[PDB]
């Protein structure tokens, strides 16, 4: 369909993967790279942690709106993949304009990282994870409402799970974040990796650690109203649920709950997918039951204080009813 070129390392060679990583970094910041090239470079970056990235992408690409031509790269000459033409020349223009474009800046806060030669496996891994971690973190601040920072990156640093040396500039991360916002395919494929990692089955411990952290944060955040509603609105089994006014909200949440059962792990990651389903499970679709649930939760659970605040859908009469029902059942 919309073909996408994906460059992938053909070997575990630290030096090949590091130059290949840098090139992908450069495509994304490049002015004369088609959005299709940039999408491919995201795949390259996102999959670089794996033993065999090309095989990772093929086994997990579930996406009809795109055709991936995965291209094996056995070696780099002058920072660009070697191909087994003008096509060579094009990949040079991508580097040159990426470089000339910015004020001598690199994708890295410490420019030294950009000129660095890596040949040790543990330094590659560390650099690759550190770069990937920063990309996944973009996914994290996307799912949140902008009603909240750096505690993320700082946590990984004190934990030494990330290497501050390979920190990307804001300008580069903004390029990446743009790409994520505009490209359903990259997000879709990231969703595949989140599902794949949960499963899981890989020995890339440090990578799947950081991907799990995000994945789990995306789940907790997007399904938080849903499950609070079930836990505090339904599970408490208050007879006030039989009031006529709750009946449509009961239908809705029954449909959503059946949904969750047949979709499976994909369901919590809907918040990252097509616009029209991102809010599938959002409590604003069953707001009276939600408000009732809020009223129970803030009454009986000391960890639920956040729910005293109206984020837009709070229905005061139903919130009060929750408080009253919770106070009535001891």
């Amino acid at each position: 369909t919309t073909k996408i070129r994906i460059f992938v390392p053909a070997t575990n060679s630290p030096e090949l993967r590091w130059e290949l990583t840098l090139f992908a970094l450069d495509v994304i910041r490049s002015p004369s790279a088609a959005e299709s090239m940039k999408v491919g470079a995201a795949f390259t970056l996102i999959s670089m942690y794996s033993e065999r990235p090309g095989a990772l992408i093929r086994s997990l690409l579930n996406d009809p709106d795109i055709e991936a031509v995965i291209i094996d790269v056995g070696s780099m000459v002058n920072g660009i993949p070697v191909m087994e033409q003008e096509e060579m020349e094009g990949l040079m223009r991508i580097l040159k304009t990426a470089r000339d474009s910015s004020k001598g800046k690199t994708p890295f806060v410490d420019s030294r990282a950009y000129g660095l030669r890596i040949t040790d496996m543990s330094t590659l891994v560390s650099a690759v994870i550190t770069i990937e971690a920063q990309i996944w973190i973009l996914i994290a601040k996307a799912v949140t409402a902008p009603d909240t920072e750096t505690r993320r990156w700082a946590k990984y640093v004190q934990q030494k799970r990330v290497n501050p040396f390979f920190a990307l500039t804001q300008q580069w991360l903004t390029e990446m974040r743009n790409l994520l916002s505009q490209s359903l395919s990259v997000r879709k494929f990231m969703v595949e990796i989140l599902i794949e990692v949960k499963k899981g089955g890989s020995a890339k411990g440090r990578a799947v650690e950081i991907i799990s952290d995000i994945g789990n944060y995306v789940e907790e955040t997007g399904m938080a109203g849903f499950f609070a509603t079930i836990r505090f609105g339904l599970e408490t089994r208050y007879p006030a649920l039989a009031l006529n006014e709750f009946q449509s909200d009961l239908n809705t949440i029954k449909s959503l709950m059946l949904l969750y059962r047949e979709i499976g792990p994909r369901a919590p990651y809907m918040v990252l997918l097509e616009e029209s389903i991102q809010t599938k499970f959002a409590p604003g679709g069953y707001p009276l039951l939600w408000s009732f649930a809020m009223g129970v939760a803030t009454t009986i659970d000391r960890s639920m204080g956040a729910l005293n605040i109206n984020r837009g859908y709070l229905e005061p009469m139903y919130f009060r009813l929750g408080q009253k029902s919770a106070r009535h059942h001891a």
Binding site: N244, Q247, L250, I253, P265
Partner: protein, 40 residues
Amino acid sequence: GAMDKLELVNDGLNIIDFIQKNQKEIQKTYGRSSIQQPSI
């Protein structure tokens, strides 16, 4: 865990089923049928 959440969903479904089938009996239990009604 994912298991605990699956049990939440299936218990959520059984609760809604019980309500929808006994909604009137429970309303005698609860004292009223509409939230706009005085409770007692």
